[PDB]
PDB file of C-alpha atoms in Angstrom:
ATOM      1  CA  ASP A   1      91.051 271.395 174.945  1.00 37.33           C
ATOM      2  CA  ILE A   2      92.433 270.230 178.216  1.00 36.46           C
ATOM      3  CA  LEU A   3      94.519 271.296 180.558  1.00 34.54           C
ATOM      4  CA  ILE A   4      95.801 269.088 183.792  1.00 37.76           C
ATOM      5  CA  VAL A   5      97.750 270.701 186.700  1.00 37.99           C
ATOM      6  CA  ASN A   6      99.941 267.957 188.309  1.00 37.95           C
ATOM      7  CA  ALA A   7     101.464 270.431 191.135  1.00 38.24           C
ATOM      8  CA  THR A   8     101.587 267.663 195.206  1.00 36.50           C
ATOM      9  CA  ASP A   9     101.689 270.922 196.951  1.00 36.30           C
ATOM     10  CA  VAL A  10      97.787 272.160 197.364  1.00 34.77           C
ATOM     11  CA  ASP A  11      99.197 275.674 197.873  1.00 34.99           C
ATOM     12  CA  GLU A  12     100.358 276.482 194.119  1.00 35.32           C
ATOM     13  CA  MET A  13      97.512 273.981 192.094  1.00 34.87           C
ATOM     14  CA  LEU A  14      94.979 276.392 193.834  1.00 34.78           C
ATOM     15  CA  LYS A  15      96.770 279.030 191.891  1.00 36.79           C
ATOM     16  CA  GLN A  16      96.997 277.213 188.931  1.00 39.18           C
ATOM     17  CA  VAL A  17      93.538 276.718 188.777  1.00 36.79           C
ATOM     18  CA  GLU A  18      92.394 280.470 189.068  1.00 34.89           C
ATOM     19  CA  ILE A  19      94.659 281.687 186.602  1.00 33.18           C
ATOM     20  CA  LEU A  20      93.872 279.597 183.989  1.00 33.18           C
ATOM     21  CA  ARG A  21      89.998 279.948 184.392  1.00 30.55           C
ATOM     22  CA  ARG A  22      90.642 283.679 184.363  1.00 30.41           C
ATOM     23  CA  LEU A  23      92.007 283.371 180.655  1.00 30.86           C
ATOM     24  CA  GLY A  24      88.946 281.291 179.372  1.00 32.52           C
ATOM     25  CA  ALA A  25      90.208 277.494 179.584  1.00 31.29           C
ATOM     26  CA  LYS A  26      86.546 275.788 179.350  1.00 30.54           C
ATOM     27  CA  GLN A  27      88.111 272.396 180.991  1.00 30.76           C
ATOM     28  CA  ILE A  28      90.623 272.602 183.672  1.00 26.44           C
ATOM     29  CA  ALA A  29      91.830 268.800 184.909  1.00 30.25           C
ATOM     30  CA  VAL A  30      93.759 268.067 188.485  1.00 30.27           C
ATOM     31  CA  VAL A  31      95.723 264.852 188.995  1.00 30.04           C
ATOM     32  CA  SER A  32      96.586 264.730 192.844  1.00 32.46           C
ATOM     33  CA  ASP A  33      96.586 261.708 195.659  1.00 32.92           C
ATOM     34  CA  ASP A  34      94.813 263.080 198.105  1.00 32.28           C
ATOM     35  CA  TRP A  35      90.365 262.947 197.743  1.00 31.19           C
ATOM     36  CA  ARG A  36      90.544 265.848 199.427  1.00 32.83           C
ATOM     37  CA  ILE A  37      92.862 268.366 198.124  1.00 34.26           C
ATOM     38  CA  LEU A  38      90.363 266.646 194.920  1.00 31.18           C
ATOM     39  CA  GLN A  39      88.259 268.908 197.105  1.00 32.03           C
ATOM     40  CA  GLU A  40      89.178 271.651 197.287  1.00 32.54           C
ATOM     41  CA  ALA A  41      89.655 272.229 193.250  1.00 32.50           C
ATOM     42  CA  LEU A  42      85.766 271.517 192.817  1.00 30.68           C
ATOM     43  CA  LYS A  43      85.514 274.205 194.899  1.00 30.08           C
ATOM     44  CA  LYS A  44      87.395 276.199 192.867  1.00 30.46           C
ATOM     45  CA  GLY A  45      86.057 275.442 189.530  1.00 32.58           C
ATOM     46  CA  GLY A  46      87.724 272.504 188.600  1.00 32.02           C
ATOM     47  CA  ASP A  47      86.536 270.971 185.921  1.00 31.25           C
ATOM     48  CA  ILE A  48      87.743 267.891 185.781  1.00 30.58           C
ATOM     49  CA  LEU A  49      89.389 265.282 189.140  1.00 29.60           C
ATOM     50  CA  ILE A  50      91.625 262.691 188.110  1.00 28.46           C
ATOM     51  CA  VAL A  51      92.532 259.949 190.691  1.00 28.58           C
ATOM     52  CA  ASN A  52      95.819 258.325 190.756  1.00 27.71           C
ATOM     53  CA  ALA A  53      95.590 255.948 193.198  1.00 25.30           C
ATOM     54  CA  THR A  54      97.651 252.514 193.327  1.00 26.06           C
ATOM     55  CA  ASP A  55      95.158 250.369 195.914  1.00 23.33           C
ATOM     56  CA  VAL A  56      92.045 249.435 194.790  1.00 23.42           C
ATOM     57  CA  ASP A  57      89.547 249.867 197.496  1.00 26.83           C
ATOM     58  CA  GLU A  58      91.149 253.268 198.383  1.00 30.99           C
ATOM     59  CA  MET A  59      91.184 254.385 194.799  1.00 29.90           C
ATOM     60  CA  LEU A  60      86.944 252.902 194.978  1.00 30.52           C
ATOM     61  CA  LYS A  61      86.577 255.260 198.478  1.00 33.76           C
ATOM     62  CA  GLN A  62      87.547 258.334 196.908  1.00 28.27           C
ATOM     63  CA  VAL A  63      85.746 257.994 193.624  1.00 26.25           C
ATOM     64  CA  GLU A  64      82.127 257.604 195.774  1.00 28.48           C
ATOM     65  CA  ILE A  65      83.328 260.366 197.686  1.00 26.14           C
ATOM     66  CA  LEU A  66      84.185 262.412 195.261  1.00 25.28           C
ATOM     67  CA  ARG A  67      80.628 260.951 193.396  1.00 26.79           C
ATOM     68  CA  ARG A  68      78.786 261.521 196.415  1.00 27.40           C
ATOM     69  CA  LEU A  69      79.940 265.677 195.805  1.00 26.65           C
ATOM     70  CA  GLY A  70      78.640 265.972 192.990  1.00 26.35           C
ATOM     71  CA  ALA A  71      82.271 265.836 191.206  1.00 28.27           C
ATOM     72  CA  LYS A  72      80.470 265.894 187.566  1.00 31.15           C
ATOM     73  CA  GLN A  73      83.945 264.313 185.498  1.00 29.50           C
ATOM     74  CA  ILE A  74      86.492 261.665 187.329  1.00 30.27           C
ATOM     75  CA  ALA A  75      89.208 260.425 185.731  1.00 32.25           C
ATOM     76  CA  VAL A  76      91.332 257.296 186.974  1.00 31.88           C
ATOM     77  CA  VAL A  77      94.905 257.119 186.105  1.00 30.09           C
ATOM     78  CA  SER A  78      96.085 253.982 186.392  1.00 30.25           C
ATOM     79  CA  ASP A  79      99.292 251.524 185.226  1.00 32.72           C
ATOM     80  CA  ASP A  80      97.075 248.032 186.168  1.00 33.66           C
ATOM     81  CA  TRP A  81      94.320 247.479 183.676  1.00 30.44           C
ATOM     82  CA  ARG A  82      92.029 245.614 186.098  1.00 32.63           C
ATOM     83  CA  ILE A  83      91.923 248.720 188.222  1.00 34.10           C
ATOM     84  CA  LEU A  84      90.741 250.690 185.865  1.00 34.40           C
ATOM     85  CA  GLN A  85      87.594 248.205 185.315  1.00 32.97           C
ATOM     86  CA  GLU A  86      86.575 248.331 189.017  1.00 34.95           C
ATOM     87  CA  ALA A  87      86.464 252.164 188.554  1.00 33.47           C
ATOM     88  CA  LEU A  88      84.149 251.670 185.498  1.00 35.04           C
ATOM     89  CA  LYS A  89      81.912 249.363 187.351  1.00 36.49           C
ATOM     90  CA  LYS A  90      81.481 252.242 189.879  1.00 39.92           C
ATOM     91  CA  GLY A  91      81.232 254.956 187.580  1.00 41.17           C
ATOM     92  CA  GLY A  92      84.313 256.870 186.890  1.00 39.41           C
ATOM     93  CA  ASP A  93      83.544 258.609 183.718  1.00 36.97           C
ATOM     94  CA  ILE A  94      87.063 258.819 181.879  1.00 37.69           C
ATOM     95  CA  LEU A  95      89.941 255.759 181.864  1.00 36.14           C
ATOM     96  CA  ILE A  96      93.340 257.182 181.717  1.00 36.10           C
ATOM     97  CA  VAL A  97      95.556 254.360 180.065  1.00 36.24           C
ATOM     98  CA  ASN A  98      99.025 254.595 180.780  1.00 37.17           C
ATOM     99  CA  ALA A  99     101.501 251.977 179.786  1.00 35.57           C
ATOM    100  CA  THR A 100     105.370 252.246 179.007  1.00 37.79           C
ATOM    101  CA  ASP A 101     104.785 249.366 176.006  1.00 41.48           C
ATOM    102  CA  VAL A 102     103.069 249.611 173.249  1.00 41.27           C
ATOM    103  CA  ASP A 103     101.450 246.746 172.582  1.00 42.36           C
ATOM    104  CA  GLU A 104     100.769 246.733 175.888  1.00 38.64           C
ATOM    105  CA  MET A 105      98.997 249.879 176.112  1.00 35.00           C
ATOM    106  CA  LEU A 106      96.402 248.924 172.541  1.00 33.42           C
ATOM    107  CA  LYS A 107      96.011 245.981 174.329  1.00 35.14           C
ATOM    108  CA  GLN A 108      94.387 247.327 177.494  1.00 33.13           C
ATOM    109  CA  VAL A 109      92.490 250.000 175.504  1.00 29.81           C
ATOM    110  CA  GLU A 110      90.637 246.969 173.428  1.00 28.75           C
ATOM    111  CA  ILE A 111      89.426 245.802 176.129  1.00 25.41           C
ATOM    112  CA  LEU A 112      88.372 248.583 177.892  1.00 23.58           C
ATOM    113  CA  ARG A 113      86.251 249.405 175.348  1.00 24.25           C
ATOM    114  CA  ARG A 114      84.526 245.878 174.702  1.00 21.70           C
ATOM    115  CA  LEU A 115      83.783 246.245 178.788  1.00 25.10           C
ATOM    116  CA  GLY A 116      81.222 249.429 177.767  1.00 27.28           C
ATOM    117  CA  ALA A 117      83.952 252.365 178.579  1.00 28.05           C
ATOM    118  CA  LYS A 118      82.980 255.435 176.325  1.00 26.83           C
ATOM    119  CA  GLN A 119      85.962 258.272 177.512  1.00 26.86           C
ATOM    120  CA  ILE A 120      88.936 256.461 177.157  1.00 27.04           C
ATOM    121  CA  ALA A 121      92.896 258.283 177.772  1.00 27.58           C
ATOM    122  CA  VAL A 122      95.978 257.719 176.432  1.00 27.02           C
ATOM    123  CA  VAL A 123      98.860 259.415 177.817  1.00 26.36           C
ATOM    124  CA  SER A 124     102.726 259.315 177.298  1.00 29.36           C
ATOM    125  CA  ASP A 125     105.767 261.402 176.904  1.00 32.34           C
ATOM    126  CA  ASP A 126     106.623 259.783 173.506  1.00 31.98           C
ATOM    127  CA  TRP A 127     104.236 260.824 170.578  1.00 33.25           C
ATOM    128  CA  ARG A 128     104.848 257.231 169.086  1.00 32.83           C
ATOM    129  CA  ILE A 129     102.538 255.544 171.342  1.00 30.35           C
ATOM    130  CA  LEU A 130      99.908 258.349 171.007  1.00 31.72           C
ATOM    131  CA  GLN A 131      99.563 258.395 167.468  1.00 31.61           C
ATOM    132  CA  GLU A 132      99.178 254.234 167.623  1.00 31.28           C
ATOM    133  CA  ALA A 133      96.178 254.580 170.738  1.00 31.10           C
ATOM    134  CA  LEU A 134      94.832 257.453 167.511  1.00 31.44           C
ATOM    135  CA  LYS A 135      94.694 255.011 165.180  1.00 27.21           C
ATOM    136  CA  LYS A 136      93.326 252.048 167.894  1.00 25.73           C
ATOM    137  CA  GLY A 137      90.598 254.822 168.871  1.00 26.19           C
ATOM    138  CA  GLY A 138      91.379 256.189 171.847  1.00 29.98           C
ATOM    139  CA  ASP A 139      89.113 258.950 172.626  1.00 33.08           C
ATOM    140  CA  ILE A 140      91.371 260.987 174.373  1.00 34.76           C
ATOM    141  CA  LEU A 141      95.288 261.841 173.652  1.00 33.33           C
ATOM    142  CA  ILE A 142      97.734 263.437 176.821  1.00 32.18           C
ATOM    143  CA  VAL A 143     100.657 264.837 176.060  1.00 31.40           C
ATOM    144  CA  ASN A 144     103.580 264.752 178.754  1.00 32.24           C
ATOM    145  CA  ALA A 145     105.980 267.102 177.691  1.00 34.02           C
ATOM    146  CA  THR A 146     109.380 268.302 179.223  1.00 32.55           C
ATOM    147  CA  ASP A 147     109.889 271.900 177.423  1.00 33.99           C
ATOM    148  CA  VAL A 148     106.806 273.748 175.525  1.00 33.76           C
ATOM    149  CA  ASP A 149     108.533 273.131 172.153  1.00 30.94           C
ATOM    150  CA  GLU A 150     108.322 269.876 171.957  1.00 31.83           C
ATOM    151  CA  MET A 151     104.416 269.623 173.147  1.00 31.52           C
ATOM    152  CA  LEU A 152     103.594 271.817 170.962  1.00 28.18           C
ATOM    153  CA  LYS A 153     105.131 270.145 168.127  1.00 29.12           C
ATOM    154  CA  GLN A 154     103.402 267.271 169.203  1.00 30.62           C
ATOM    155  CA  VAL A 155     100.004 268.805 169.454  1.00 32.68           C
ATOM    156  CA  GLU A 156      99.853 270.017 166.131  1.00 32.05           C
ATOM    157  CA  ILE A 157     100.929 266.728 164.567  1.00 25.95           C
ATOM    158  CA  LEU A 158      98.108 264.995 166.276  1.00 26.54           C
ATOM    159  CA  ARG A 159      95.538 267.282 165.604  1.00 28.40           C
ATOM    160  CA  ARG A 160      97.117 267.177 161.820  1.00 30.73           C
ATOM    161  CA  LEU A 161      96.370 263.384 161.837  1.00 31.51           C
ATOM    162  CA  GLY A 162      93.003 264.603 163.092  1.00 33.85           C
ATOM    163  CA  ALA A 163      92.712 263.992 166.818  1.00 32.54           C
ATOM    164  CA  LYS A 164      90.016 265.324 168.481  1.00 30.98           C
ATOM    165  CA  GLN A 165      90.483 266.326 172.128  1.00 33.14           C
ATOM    166  CA  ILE A 166      93.827 266.600 173.203  1.00 32.00           C
ATOM    167  CA  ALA A 167      94.910 266.808 176.940  1.00 34.91           C
ATOM    168  CA  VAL A 168      98.076 268.279 178.153  1.00 36.12           C
ATOM    169  CA  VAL A 169      99.663 267.739 181.274  1.00 36.01           C
ATOM    170  CA  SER A 170     102.160 269.905 183.245  1.00 35.54           C
ATOM    171  CA  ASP A 171     103.521 271.415 186.217  1.00 36.45           C
ATOM    172  CA  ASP A 172     104.420 274.970 184.545  1.00 36.66           C
ATOM    173  CA  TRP A 173     100.929 277.331 183.606  1.00 39.16           C
ATOM    174  CA  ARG A 174     103.731 279.316 181.035  1.00 40.15           C
ATOM    175  CA  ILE A 175     103.502 275.910 179.307  1.00 41.85           C
ATOM    176  CA  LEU A 176      99.244 275.004 179.656  1.00 41.35           C
ATOM    177  CA  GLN A 177      98.914 278.725 178.888  1.00 43.20           C
ATOM    178  CA  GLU A 178     100.481 278.598 176.071  1.00 41.87           C
ATOM    179  CA  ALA A 179      98.627 274.909 175.222  1.00 42.31           C
ATOM    180  CA  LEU A 180      95.213 276.604 175.406  1.00 42.45           C
ATOM    181  CA  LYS A 181      96.709 279.465 172.550  1.00 38.91           C
ATOM    182  CA  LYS A 182      97.360 277.086 170.208  1.00 36.17           C
TER     183      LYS A 182
END
């Protein structure tokens, strides 16, 4: 469904973006520390922009900026649910819960739901956690695996369990190209 490019070297990301768009990928996302890097990813045809910041007001600044440029889909990722709430208050389209422990994850999801979050995403390399997030009701599931074999295995299973929007994040366009075909 969604292919997330994560390569800090601005040179390479631009290449990956150009390749995947050529291969008929409808939804492409980019995650970065620099809204400036995010800016050109959009100019080159990046569907989704994922702000990955720590300081709340630094994040608030980048979101507003990216909104001003007319970025339609902006996502925020952080471990602290309070930051995600603040992002939601400012019109963040997608909220990405990134927690290690399952009970902390499920706690943060429900909170954001209640506060009116419409697109909640969950990321983790443990597909045991992703499965529970699906039962709970998380909208988007982001698979983060080291090798392709394990990544395709998780997608199929999650598909089997009824996931409808599955995102895959990697540094390896061959891997992402594999995800799209599947």
